[PDB]
Design a protein around this ligand. Structure first.
Ligand SMILES: NC(=O)[C@H]1CCCN(C(=O)Cc2cccc3c2OCO3)C1
Ligand SMILES: [Zn+2]
Length: 139
C-alpha cells in the first residue's frame, strides 16, 4: 500500500484504488497501473522533474529504504492477476531490489523529489510506475 499527496491530488496504484478514489476520479490509466483522485486537504509532496536513474525506494516487506539504479521509463511485460491480463505496462522503470506484492505504493525518490511508486516485481527485481511526466499534478 501507499500513495503520493501533491496539492489537491492523491496518486495511487490503479489496482489498489478505493471506492472514494473512483468517486473523486481525475484521471486513470490501466496501461500505467495509475489512478489520480481529488482530495480536500492539501498535499506537500514534491514531484521530481528530471531524468535521474538513481534514487531510494521504501520497501514495506522489509520496513527499510534501499538505494537503487533504475531503467528509463519504458513498455515492459506483466503476468495476470485479479487486476490485469498479460500486457505491456507503459512508463515502467526496473531496478535490482527486493519486492513483494504488498510493496506496491512505496515511493521512489531522488534528490529532486518523488519519481514514482512501486507497481510490479519478482525474481530480485522491482518495477516502479513513473510520475515525472505528469506535469499537471503541480497546477
Ligand atoms: N502492475 C501490475 O500489473 C501488478 C499488479 C499486482 C500484481 N503484480 C505484481 O508484480 C505482484 C508482485 C509480485 C512480487 C513482487 C512485487 C509485486 O508487486 C510489487 O513487487 C503486477
Ligand atoms: Zn532526479
Amino acid at each position: 500500500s501507499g500513495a503520493i499527496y501533491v496539492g489537491n491530488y492523491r496518486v495511487v496504484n490503479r489496482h489498489l484504488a478505493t471506492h472514494n478514489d473512483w468517486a473523486n476520479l481525475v484521471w486513470e490509466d490501466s496501461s500505467r497501473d495509475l489512478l489520480v483522485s481529488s482530495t480536500t486537504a492539501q498535499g506537500c509532496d514534491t514531484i521530481a522533474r528530471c531524468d535521474c536513474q538513481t534514487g531510494v525506494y521504501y520497501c514495506s516487506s522489509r520496513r527499510k529504504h534501499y538505494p537503487v539504479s533504475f531503467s528509463k521509463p519504458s513498455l515492459i511485460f506483466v503476468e495476470a492477476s485479479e487486476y490485469y491480463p498479460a500486457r505491456y505496462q507503459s512508463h515502467l522503470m526496473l531496478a535490482v531490489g527486493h519486492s513483494e506484492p504488498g510493496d506496491c505504493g512505496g515511493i521512489l525518490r531522488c534528490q529532486h523529489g518523488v519519481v514514482g511508486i512501486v507497481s510490479t516485481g519478482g525474481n530480485g527485481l522491482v518495477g516502479f510506475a513513473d510520475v515525472r511526466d505528469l506535469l499537471w499534478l503541480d497546477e
